[PDB]
Structure 1
Amino acid sequence: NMLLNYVPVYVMLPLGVVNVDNVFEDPDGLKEQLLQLRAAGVDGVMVDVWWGIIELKGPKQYDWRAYRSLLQLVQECGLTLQAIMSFHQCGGNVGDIVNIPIPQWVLDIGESNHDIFYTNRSGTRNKEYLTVGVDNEPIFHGRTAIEIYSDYMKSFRENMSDFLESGLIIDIEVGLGPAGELRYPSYPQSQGWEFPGIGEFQCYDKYLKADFKAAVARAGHPEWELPDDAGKYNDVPESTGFFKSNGTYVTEKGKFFLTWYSNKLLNHGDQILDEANKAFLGCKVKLAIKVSGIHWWYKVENHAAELTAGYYNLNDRDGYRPIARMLSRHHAILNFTCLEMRDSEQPSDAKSGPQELVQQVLSGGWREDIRVAGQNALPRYDATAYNQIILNARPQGVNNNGPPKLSMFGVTYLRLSDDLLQKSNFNIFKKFVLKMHADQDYCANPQKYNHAITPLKPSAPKIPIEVLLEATKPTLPFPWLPETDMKVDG
């Protein structure tokens, strides 16, 4: 049956649907929009559950009331929900039209200890997320950063228990860094970064610097220092000593640093996911993390932008499959957030390969036998964008005999706005939804298309770092069709 080819579609809700004062501002307005989505066959919606709004007053001072009202409305509108545990700030990244800082009480501690923030070589502190350096430092009124995240998710589970039991929440997206993505804030617009700048390493806070120094000492090179020839945010790779041909990134010193830098993210994610598995154990939901799509400079040997973000990906070293393998022990979903771009849409001087990057990441995930989901990186309303998303959703097209050999677990569309609802735009979006559903009508029971969700099982045993890194072995991607067999153009 064709339903086996069905890929669910979710729509992101506006940022700030619940304001900084923890108030569900316009219920009636959202309702009408939500009903529009329901009639269009949309499967569900995605929302940020902002740490800065909920635990604002103080440690463990949670107020879940506004979010309970929101979930109630979504449920009433016949939609499922993807809940993001947003432990980051809204404001300094593209599209952030509202300002939502992390909890003030955490920022107060940051006033006396500036090193709890990601820091660049110049010493600029980025306050949008707590550095991985303090994940296990008990400096937040007795708790470590990971315990804060853990306590938050547990409180969410217990306070939204009725919604979880009724099957409203489809998956929990665990925020692991800037914009909720597992990465370093290497391209901060708030510090002047501009596409296609290579970005900057963010390992200069005292905790990470100390860890690095101890690490190189144990490696027999106590004199090694953090990169000091990597240039600045808006530089191009060839103008730096670190990324130029035969540069530092290829020396023993450089390879050690890059391995150390990227391993911190793998462990950061693995440790917090452990806490997430415990908090939602037994619940009928799946866990997911977000991986950013850094396509600029992907076409040059150095992959500079990926490297500064923490993805140690080179033409001869797969820096994404290790993440996918890590996720397998948690039975988690890899949500890749750059699914709509085509290489030709990028300026030539950016050496951008979003199409190839997508193929590499998705293939790596299917290779490791984990579920892969996606999302468009920038707002798009045109058919070419939707057609590219549909292609990536089912790389080899639909199968009339049974399930397609390759398919994504779901796609989340950014974002709900008045522009999307405009007659012509919404008309195209409806066709997009239809094609994602493989020409089938909206299907309320996920079991029908083999998406039944069972109780969350405890994570499998810890996988040693050396085993995760075996996944760095380059592999050929799965074959992609030149264009989808389910085009919106009709």
Structure 2
Amino acid sequence: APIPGVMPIGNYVSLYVMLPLGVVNADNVFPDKEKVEDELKQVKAGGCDGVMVDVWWGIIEAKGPKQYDWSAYRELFQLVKKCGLKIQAIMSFHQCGGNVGDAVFIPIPQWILQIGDKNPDIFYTNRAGNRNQEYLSLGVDNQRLFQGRTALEMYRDFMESFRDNMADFLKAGDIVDIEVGCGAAGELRYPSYPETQGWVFPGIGEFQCYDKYMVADWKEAVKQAGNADWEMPGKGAGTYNDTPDKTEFFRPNGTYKTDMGKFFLTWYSNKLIIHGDQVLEEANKVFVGLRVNIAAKVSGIHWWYNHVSHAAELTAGFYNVAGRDGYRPIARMLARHHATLNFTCLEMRDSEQPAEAKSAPQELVQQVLSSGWKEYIDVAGENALPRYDATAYNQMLLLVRPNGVNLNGPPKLKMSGLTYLRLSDDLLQTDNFELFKKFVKKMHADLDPSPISPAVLERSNSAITIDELMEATKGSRPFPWYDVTDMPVDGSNPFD
């Protein structure tokens, strides 16, 4: 039996905090150095392991192709290191802000956007012909349109430059995680619920495959299946703020369940998996042999999860329905690259969502974490929305150790890390910050903050075919979850 009071260190879950947006600004300057230094000191003194920051493509490569300026990011990283903190860096090949609310606006490089004025099909496009300018469509990953480069080559060259220009932070163990941005907002998904085209929760979203590149690919695919005339979804799919039962495509027994529907949903979800595969392959080639994790971010699309159609999942590109696990194939792709899955919604409870949304964040998290663990990858995560209350912190503590602490060794089920959204004035307010420090102590299994490295990143494994990957869609039971955390922020123990 274990010795009373001894907590095995394998129970510890690292806790990182996301830096404010614009910490390095759109002119590639790091302003308010003193304020930031101060915040970093408070975060460290609260026990946090590190911080996460976006490394914005539209800052670094702004002046032109392969003109990279890493100066301000080096100053920031040096400061974080000096405050005793680890760094998670996001390779952010997407747009920051741009709405009236948003305090910062950083588009992708203007020399890319200029290409888009004359070729709007470089962007994800909805069936009405709206272009999302926040990210380059997967349809252009391998199109040599960008002053002699393809999109994948641009991503590769940027990551190589980052590695070479941060070589000393990488050697010293200061940079611990590279999150590779794979879509708008950095997430591996289609931009199916854009605020800029009027989406409001809990709309079903819209398919984002109408650019001419993805269309040429589709037309070829359906011809080979023996159905030349199958079209992409039309008016039957409805629009962003429909509910599934108001559509033909997503109603019970609707189009999604027809042979044409299944064929379309397979193709659509496979193009997203292939895009992830190609982007992470480039990351693995850059970072192989270094002690750093490489991660992809999958957003938690929890609305309509309890509807037969899983319509919001489907429009986002995750073909997850009864009898078809749409996340496990992503995890298996990730495993090939020795990459980590970063998921969201770790704080959410089903009872917090309106009933009409058919929303099940708890069961979604359980499915996705279970499917990643079954593929022998690490899974990390984030809170989806800002939360400062004990209920939220206790839900995240449940998710990071879904069968609580293990006094005999490392837990059976443990997330590899949590990144908290986000450092702000509200978080540092005296009351909230007090609660937050208890959350961090519980993340650490009541151990003291404890600095060593990620594993050495192995080279990507040999390729498997699309069809071998589809074996991973077989449905399975998720691991059983506890109903409450072991280590609530009030210090009690619900098992005594």
What TM-score, normalized to structure 2?
A: 0.96
Aligned to 1:341: 348
Deviations 1:388-409 (A, max 9, x none): 0000000000011111111000
State whether residues 435 and 486 of structure 1, in contact with CA within 8 Å, keep that contact through their aligned partners in structure 2: yes
**1: CA distance, partners of 2:100 / 2:174:** 29
CA distance 1:52–1:43, change in 2 (3 Å): same
Aligned to 2:465: 464
CA distance 1:271–1:191, change in 2 (3 Å): same
Per the TM alignment, residue 463 of structure 1 is displaced from its structure 2 partner at its CA by: 2.0
**2: CA distance, partners of 1:297 / 1:244:** 12
CA distance 1:309–1:126, change in 2 (3 Å): same
Letter in 1 for 2:196: S
Aligned to 2:42: 36
Q: Does 1:486 align with 2:492?
A: no
Match of 1:62 among 68, 71, 79: 68
Aligned to 2:137: 131
**2: CA distance, partners of 1:96 / 1:154:** 31
**2: CA distance, partners of 1:409 / 1:400:** 18
Per the TM alignment, residue 339 of structure 1 is displaced from its structure 2 partner at its CA by: 0.8
State whether residues 15 and 96 of structure 1, in contact with CA within 8 Å, keep that contact through their aligned partners in structure 2: no
Q: Does 1:250 align with 2:251?
A: no
Give the CA RMSD over aligned residues: 1.1
**1: CA distance, partners of 2:31 / 2:246:** 49
**2: CA distance, partners of 1:95 / 1:136:** 35
1:399-418 superposed matches below 5 A = 399-418=406-425
**2: CA distance, partners of 1:94 / 1:225:** 37
Aligned to 2:322: 315
Describe the SS at the equivalent of 2:237.
coil
Describe the SS at the equivalent of 1:196.
coil
Aligned length: 484
State whether residues 282 and 455 of structure 1, in contact with CA within 8 Å, keep that contact through their aligned partners in structure 2: yes
Per the TM alignment, residue 178 of structure 1 is displaced from its structure 2 partner at its CA by: 1.1
1:147-226 superposed matches below 5 A = 147-226=153-232
**1: CA distance, partners of 2:172 / 2:201:** 44
Describe the SS at the equivalent of 1:258.
helix
Q: Does 1:91 align with 2:92?
A: no
**1: CA distance, partners of 2:292 / 2:400:** 21
Per the TM alignment, residue 90 of structure 1 is displaced from its structure 2 partner at its CA by: 1.1
**2: CA distance, partners of 1:27 / 1:10:** 20
Letter in 1 for 2:187: E
Per the TM alignment, residue 96 of structure 1 is displaced from its structure 2 partner at its CA by: 5.0
**1: CA distance, partners of 2:469 / 2:415:** 23
CA distance 1:464–1:96, change in 2 (3 Å): farther
Aligned to 2:113: 107
State whether residues 92 and 190 of structure 1, in contact with CA within 8 Å, keep that contact through their aligned partners in structure 2: no
State whether residues 92 and 188 of structure 1, in contact with CA within 8 Å, keep that contact through their aligned partners in structure 2: no
* Structure 1: stretches of 5+ with no match in the other structure: 447-451
Letter in 2 for 1:17: V
Letter in 2 for 1:169: I
Deviations 1:417-470 (A, max 9, x none): 0100000000000000000100111001x3xxxxx4233221111122112111
Per the TM alignment, residue 97 of structure 1 is displaced from its structure 2 partner at its CA by: 3.7
Per the TM alignment, residue 95 of structure 1 is displaced from its structure 2 partner at its CA by: 8.4
Paired-residue identity, % = 69
Deviations 1:363-389 (A, max 9, x none): 001111110001000000000000000
**2: CA distance, partners of 1:337 / 1:106:** 30
Aligned to 2:400: 393
CA distance 1:186–1:456, change in 2 (3 Å): same
**1: CA distance, partners of 2:464 / 2:97:** 36
Letter in 2 for 1:108: Q
Aligned to 2:85: 79
Per the TM alignment, residue 93 of structure 1 is displaced from its structure 2 partner at its CA by: 8.2
Per the TM alignment, residue 32 of structure 1 is displaced from its structure 2 partner at its CA by: 0.3
Q: Does 1:234 align with 2:241?
A: yes
**1: CA distance, partners of 2:253 / 2:373:** 34
1:252-267 superposed matches below 5 A = 252-267=259-274
State whether residues 13 and 415 of structure 1, in contact with CA within 8 Å, keep that contact through their aligned partners in structure 2: yes
Aligned to 1:46: 52
**2: CA distance, partners of 1:158 / 1:384:** 43
What TM-score, normalized to structure 1?
A: 0.97
Describe the SS at the equivalent of 2:177.
strand
* Structure 2: stretches of 5+ with no match in the other structure: 1-6, 492-496
Q: Does 1:370 align with 2:371?
A: no
**2: CA distance, partners of 1:173 / 1:96:** 23
**1: CA distance, partners of 2:438 / 2:377:** 28
Deviations 1:204-235 (A, max 9, x none): 00000110011101111110111001000000
Letter in 1 for 2:260: K
Deviations 1:107-153 (A, max 9, x none): 00000101000000000111000000000000101100000000000
State whether residues 121 and 204 of structure 1, in contact with CA within 8 Å, keep that contact through their aligned partners in structure 2: yes
Letter in 2 for 1:412: T
Match of 2:152 among 146, 150, 154: 146
Aligned to 1:297: 304
More displaced, 459-468 or 197-206?
A: 459-468
CA distance 1:174–1:93, change in 2 (3 Å): farther
Per the TM alignment, residue 312 of structure 1 is displaced from its structure 2 partner at its CA by: 0.4
State whether residues 98 and 106 of structure 2, in contact with CA within 8 Å, keep that contact through their aligned partners in structure 1: no
Letter in 2 for 1:486: M
**2: CA distance, partners of 1:51 / 1:172:** 14
**2: CA distance, partners of 1:94 / 1:380:** 23
Q: Does 1:280 align with 2:287?
A: yes
CA distance 1:476–1:96, change in 2 (3 Å): farther
Q: Does 1:428 align with 2:435?
A: yes
Letter in 1 for 2:443: M
**1: CA distance, partners of 2:293 / 2:141:** 23
Deviations 1:244-280 (A, max 9, x none): 1211111111100000000011100011111101111
Q: Does 1:118 align with 2:124?
A: yes
Letter in 2 for 1:203: C
Letter in 1 for 2:185: A
Aligned to 1:449: none
